[PDB]
């Protein structure tokens, strides 16, 4: 079998992507964000307390003739953003672009943090790290892409994210029309759950390629490109006026510039990302000073290729015995 659903920007700064999922029977469609960083799919639901939901489709167990309470499980979830959520467990059908699932555990939120109510446009996660991160309690539930693996063409699935555009998921299969020249591979860690690799290196603009490891994580549950201090440094020092600042909370520049590209290593090969795949606009409402899409790593405890590098490339995540990474531009 195969899946290939289309997954689309919750606004104008790619701040994160939604794909629809079909969730029991008669189908209830929710838009979740697909989470290569953690490992639950939890949703929106009718046991979500009513303050907390604020436009949010929410998922209905009693309505769907194929969801089972699964007894005595809960689960709860802290996020590298300090966001959370927790609630209890259903088992029921979940399909993703036309790749069905059954059994599947299905986490209905009762308690979300503030920043899920704020943002009406997700209706919940579908993690797609590795099942050992999963929350559930006392039993572990596996992710959808592990439990559909069997089934699928080939144990892949792959991140087609868009600048300012629509992508796609694809389950079973890689669509050959979907990048341009090879696909280069890369050795994952599974160790601490993560599609863990490391990057061979980074060059800033038009300049020359510096060999050095950058151990990171393929995270598409996270907006930005953060790496460590040396290289971020680099980066901004090309830009006139950049600075961090400590009460923005990161590196901002002035929104007059034209940011350089970045370019970062698989093995041989590289990935590079347009300057404005960078700028993710000021850093509030009619202010000139604009917030930086490359940050720090320092003090999250680990570099987290995120969506702004995710999205200059194809990304292979291969689910093989022996897991790998596979990037390419497109």
Known sequence: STGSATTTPIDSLDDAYITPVQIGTPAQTLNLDFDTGSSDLWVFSSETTASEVDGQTIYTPSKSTTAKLLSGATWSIS?????????????????????????????????????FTEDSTIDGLLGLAFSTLNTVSPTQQKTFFDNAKASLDSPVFTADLGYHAPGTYNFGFIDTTAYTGSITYTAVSTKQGFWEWTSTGYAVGSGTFKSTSIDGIADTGTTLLYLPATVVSAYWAQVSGAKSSSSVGGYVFPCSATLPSFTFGVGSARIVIPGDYIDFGPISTGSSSCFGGIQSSAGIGINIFGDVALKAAFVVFNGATTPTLGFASK
């Open 79 to 115: 996020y590298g953003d300090g966001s959370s959520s927790s609630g209890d467990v259903y088992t029921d059908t979940v399909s993703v672009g036309g790749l069905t699932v059954t059994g599947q555990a299905v986490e209905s939120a009762k308690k979300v943090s503030s920043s």
